[PDB]
Amino acid sequence: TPAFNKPKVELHVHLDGAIKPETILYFGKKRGIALPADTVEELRNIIGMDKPLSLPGFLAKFDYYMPVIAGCREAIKRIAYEFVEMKAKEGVVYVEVRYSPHLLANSKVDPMPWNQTEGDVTPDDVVDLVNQGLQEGEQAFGIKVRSILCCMRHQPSWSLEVLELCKKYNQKTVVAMDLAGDETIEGSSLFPGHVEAYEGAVKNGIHRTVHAGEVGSPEVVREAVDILKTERVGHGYHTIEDEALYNRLLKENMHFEVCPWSSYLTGAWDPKTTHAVVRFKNDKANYSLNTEDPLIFKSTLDTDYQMTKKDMGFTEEEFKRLNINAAKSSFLPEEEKKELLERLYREYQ
Numbered sequence: 001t002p003a004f005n006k007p008k009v010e011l012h013v014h015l016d017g018a019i020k021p022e023t024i025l026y027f028g029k030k031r032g033i034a035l036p037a038d039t040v041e042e043l044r045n046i047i048g049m050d051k052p053l054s055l056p057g058f059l060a061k062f063d064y065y066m067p068v069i070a071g072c073r074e075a076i077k078r079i080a081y082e083f084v085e086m087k088a089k090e091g092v093v094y095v096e097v098r099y100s101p102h103l104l105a106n107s108k109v110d111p112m113p114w115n116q117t118e119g120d121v122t123p124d125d126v127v128d129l130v131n132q133g134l135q136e137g138e139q140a141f142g143i144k145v146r147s148i149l150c151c152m153r154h155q156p157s158w159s160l161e162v163l164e165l166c167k168k169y170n171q172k173t174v175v176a177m178d179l180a181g182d183e184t185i186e187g188s189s190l191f192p193g194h195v196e197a198y199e200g201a202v203k204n205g206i207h208r209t210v211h212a213g214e215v216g217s218p219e220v221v222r223e224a225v226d227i228l229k230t231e232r233v234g235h236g237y238h239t240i241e242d243e244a245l246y247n248r249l250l251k252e253n254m255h256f257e258v259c260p261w262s263s264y265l266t267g268a269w270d271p272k273t274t275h276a277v278v279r280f281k282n283d284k285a286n287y288s289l290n291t292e293d294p295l296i297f298k299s300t301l302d303t304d305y306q307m308t309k310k311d312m313g314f315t316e317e318e319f320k321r322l323n324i325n326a327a328k329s330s331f332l333p334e335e336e337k338k339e340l341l342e343r344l345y346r347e348y349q
């Protein structure tokens, strides 16, 4: 009994956080790289989370498997193809997948991630590989998929290259630029490289989204909106703490990419207090429901819908509403955006 057994739109999920324990296990053995466990079940209990951690603590779960995928063309392409398949099964008709091309390369990246040995999988090459896997999956499962390239908060030197990658692969799946990573790194939103990459995104027409306000204060969101110029805000739960900012973003119709389950598990939400999404629902705010990192939260898109249904009392009326806003707020060109909307209204009939 799915909470919302109808077509959905997902705007917030990381490719490297949506991998199958099985594929992780396959390449661990195939490359002879160690994993913390040798059974999908135990691998899933080590990588996955049962209780709230902190943002930096949760972020460490990637250390376990990223080395197994990074540097391998076959793996990079495969996880891209299998991602589409996963989303197809969840009943998602349009998705924007995000990831850091740098954390998957093993050549022309400094610092070299995961202590890898120089290879030939360049940051540009990883973008192309994901594109190919994404496209093959679209043909095979029939859903539309697009990508977003992430800037890492702690590594602003990578930022201008991410911008260049967005320019090159513009619409070749690539639709936007994101700022992901450790939100707690004081002043990370303001590092020159990040600011300059975003200034360039604005002048070159490249779409923008920024993780902000999951753990930081209203000010981090204010910097994302005012200085960085995001078109959307990843999370943004703390925005409501500044009635002025909240009400202003509400007026401009700012889109908040909400991830309920994630907010609880990253410690970002005290289950005693009313979840920010409730305020958004009541205020009729522009927001979407997202999974964020399904692998680590041992979850599915339905996890998040069920959660808002059971607690927070969401209805099908709201599920349809927020999905229309997600389609209106997607980074799809106008014509593709109309087609998506047409599709949903038909199926919501």
Ligand SMILES: OC[C@H]1O[C@@H](n2c[nH+]c3cncnc32)[C@H](O)[C@@H]1O
Pocket (backbone or CB within 6 Å): 014, 015, 016, 017, 059, 062, 098, 099, 100, 103, 150, 180, 181, 182, 183, 211, 292, 293
């Ligand atoms: O998907 C690109 C990167 O975004 C970071 N990321 C994943 N989930 C996140 C939640 N919040 C902030 N950053 C996150 C990860 O370090 C992953 O390597």
Ligand SMILES: [Zn+2]
Pocket (backbone or CB within 6 Å): 012, 013, 014, 180, 211, 234, 292
């Ligand atoms: Zn995220």
